[PDB]
Every structure is written in C-alpha cells, then in structure tokens.
Design a protein around this ligand. Structure first.
Ligand SMILES: Cc1cccc(-c2nc(N)sc2-c2ccc3ncccc3n2)c1
Length: 427
C-alpha cells in the first residue's frame, strides 16, 4: 500500500550497488537524508513471504558495524531498500590515501568487521558476499566501518554481468561455490580481506575470473612473499584458522575476536603492502570504469529511441516539446539550450556530446589514478591484467589494439585506451 515516491524524493546519485543503483534521497516532511537502493524486478531466490520476514528482522537489528535499514517498499517493477547514509567512502579507497599502514591499523579494521559479523551470526543472518566494496566508512579518515548488504544480498539472484561480478571471486568461500554453506563462509571472506590488508595481494589470484575461482576451490595459498617476513606469526596463525577449508573445522567469528592477535594489536609500517593495495585497487577501479564506459556507450539506445519519439514533429521543435520528449523517455533541457541559444537534431547532438564528454572524464580519472608514475601510458602487460579482471578475451583486445594503432610498440596512452574500449562495444 505505502508508496516510496509519496515519502522520498531523489537528490543525487551516491554510486553503484549490488542488485541495483544507490540514490541519495530526502524525506519530503522531516528532511532526513537516506541511501536508497533501487532493485529492478534481478530474479528472486525465495518467495515474497521469506523476503518480508527477513526485512522485518533486519529492521529491528542494531550494531555500530552493521548498516542500518529503515524501510522497504515494492511496486510492480522495483524494490526499494531505504537505509542510513555513510559519507566516508569505501575502506580500501581510504587505505590507499594513507602514508603509513601497520599491523595495528589492520587489526583495528578486522576487529570492527568481526564484531559486526559475530552479532549477525547470533541473529542467524549470513552475508555470503562480504568484500571490501561492502565495507563503508562513516567519515573519510583512519572511523567506524559499516558492513553493507548483510542478509539482503542472498535474497536476490547474483548478476551474471561482469560489471557487477568484478571484485567478487577473490572473497567467496569454496563451499559457497559447491552449494552447501552456512555462517562460516563469512569468516573465510574476512580471512581473505585480512590477507590483503597485511600483504596487499589476494591469497587466491589469477589472470581472469575462472582462474581465481580454481585457486579458491583448491583452497591452497602461501605466506611465501617478501612482504610476509615483516608480519607477526600471530597474524599468520589467525589467517590459517580463518582460511581453514572444511567449514566445521574453521574458527567462528566470535573465536576470531578472542584470538591473541586481535587482543594484542587492538608498529612498523607495511610499506610494500600499501604499494600493492594501491596497485590492486587501481586495477580493480580502472577495470570497473572501463566496463561502465562501454556500458554507458551502448546505453547512449537512448539516442536512437529519443529520435523516434521526437512522431512528435520544419526540422524544429519548441522548448515545451523537447521537455515532453525527454519526459516520455526541465533544468537539464535549459543547460543544453544555453550553449545553443533551435533544431531538434542540434539539441540531441549537443545533449549526446555533453554525456559523451562526461563519460570520457570518469574513465580518464580512473586511467590517471592507475598511472601512478605519471608516465601517461599503460603497458601491454598492464592491459592484460586490466582486460583479465574485466573478462575481455586476449586475442580480441590485441586485435582491437592493432586496429587503433599498428605501431603501438606495447603501450597505449589514454586516447588510445579509450579508442580500444569503443571498438570493444561496437563503436
Ligand atoms: C540495503 C542498502 C540500502 C541502500 C544502499 C545500499 C548500498 N549497497 C551497496 N552495494 S553500496 C550501498 C550504500 C549505502 C550507503 C551509502 N551512503 C553513502 C554513499 C554510498 C552508499 N552506498 C544498501
């Protein structure tokens, strides 16, 4: 009965989310700001009665390391999950900005994650999809960590699209892959995050999604990297208990809080681990940005559908007709007409070019951030890692690279990298 739009109004986009987009919304009466995830009816893993009883329980739970869920709405085409706003950004984006990072800083982070998990397991809730992207900070500083999507992510079907799958294979418990899993899968995922905090490298890695999942399924890893020599044996011992293969023999979330490592450490800088987490995060973010650029190019579909609507027609249209044309597919129309002042062809051309330039700018920021030595280029070896994480076939991107520039000599600048992505999405 209760309608979302009768209570909240959208303000601005907050970012991407699993199963849906996240919008900053404001209560039309009290002015309370809220984070709203909009899930487009994404298949349902359970019946409607199971989702209602889970949401009812989740709304009553309260922990400082768990995101607060306020409301839940549903209409013919979407589900709306209304919760609290956390403005500190993603945890790993904060870690890469720091000059120093020690074993105390890592233990302080992992104590908060484990506190949240222990509390949710007491209430029979399983996350399953715990990963760095679901660890948000209340403020942008070295701040309380809030775990996102705890108990919600499992009621919806996992997206098969690589844009949503990037940064997930590293953290999934092996038993989740084979189908029989319980709350112990959340301890495995935290054990993987702890391994990355102390070395900057994932324990289970590979050239592509499937190669990572093969390493996870075997469950073998090592502490044989120069970084690990500067880490205590108490940290390595906790990681071993957390990354125990058989779930019944794996340590509980509660017993991990009571581990000597967490009690002792909650301080030499792990310099090589910071350099590696920066490279890891840069790679993940540029692969995501590359997929969202290709996604936005195919969507901008919008240019073809808007032309067939604007039926509505001298090669010219009034201001009100252009507003009606956009609403079928007010301030945004005036910003396009400002650069012009009109013909409907020049309006769509100026509006499309405005969305193209802004799409190019988000990709460019990710490219610049990946290019940490400010060389202006990325090597063929770096392209192989980026296209590996984004699941673009080796022969396909190498052919496209030769088409863009026959004399590339194993490197690409931003313009060339952008040209490669256009050809990889039919442009
Ligand atoms: C169930 C639910 C409801 C509303 C949002 C989300 C949510 N899911 C994600 N995967 S990121 C996110 C979130 C939360 C709060 C945020 N606050 C400020 C910026 C980005 C944010 N993003 C989950």
């Amino acid at each position: 009965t209760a309608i979302f739009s009768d209570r909240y109004k959208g303000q601005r986009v907050l970012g991407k989310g699993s199963f849906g987009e996240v919008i900053l919304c404001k209560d039309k009466i009290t002015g309370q700001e809220c984070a709203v995830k909009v899930i487009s009816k994404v298949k349902q893993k359970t019946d409607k009665e199971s989702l209602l009883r889970e949401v009812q329980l989740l709304k009553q739970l309260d922990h400082p390391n768990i995101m607060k869920l306020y409301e839940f709405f549903e209409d013919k085409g979407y589900f709306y999950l209304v919760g609290e706003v956390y403005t500190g950004g993603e945890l790993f984006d904060e870690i890469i900005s720091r000059k120093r990072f020690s074993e105390v800083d890592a233990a302080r982070i992992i104590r908060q994650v484990l506190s949240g998990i222990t509390y949710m397991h007491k209430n029979k809730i399983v996350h399953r999809d715990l990963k760095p992207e679901n660890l948000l900070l209340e403020s942008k500083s070295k701040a309380n960590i809030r775990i996102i999507d705890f108990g919600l992510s499992t009621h919806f079907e996992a997206s098969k699209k690589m844009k949503d799958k990037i940064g997930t294979a590293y953290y999934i418990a092996p038993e989740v892959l084979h189908g029989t899993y319980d709350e112990k899968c959340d301890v495995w995922s935290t054990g993987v995050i702890l391994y990355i905090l102390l070395s900057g490298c994932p324990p289970f890695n590979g050239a592509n999604e499937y190669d990572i999942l093969k390493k996870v399924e075997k469950g073998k890893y090592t502490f044989e990297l120069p970084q690990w020599k500067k880490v205590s044996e108490s940290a390595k011992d906790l990681i071993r208990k957390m990354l125990t293969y058989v779930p019944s023999m794996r340590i509980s979330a509660r017993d991990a809080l009571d581990h000597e490592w967490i009690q002792t450490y909650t301080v030499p800088s792990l310099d090589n681990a910071i350099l590696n987490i920066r490279q890891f995060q840069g790679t993940q973010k540029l692969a995501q940005a590359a997929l969202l650029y290709m996604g936005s190019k195919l969507t901008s579909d919008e240019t073809k559908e808007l032309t067939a609507i604007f039926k509505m027609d001298d090669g010219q249209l009034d201001r009100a007709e252009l507003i009606e044309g956009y609403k079928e597919l007010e301030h945004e129309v005036d910003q396009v007409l400002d650069a012009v002042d009109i013909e409907y062809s020049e309006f769509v051309t100026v509006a499309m070019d405005r969305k193209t330039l802004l799409s190019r700018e988000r990709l460019e920021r990710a490219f610049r951030m990946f290019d940490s030595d400010n060389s202006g280029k990325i090597s063929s070896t770096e392209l192989a890692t980026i296209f590996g994480v984004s699941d673009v076939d080796s022969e396909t991107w190498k052919s496209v690279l030769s088409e863009v520039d026959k004399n590339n000599d194993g490197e690409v600048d931003f313009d060339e990298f952008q040209q490669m992505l256009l050809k990889l999405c039919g442009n």
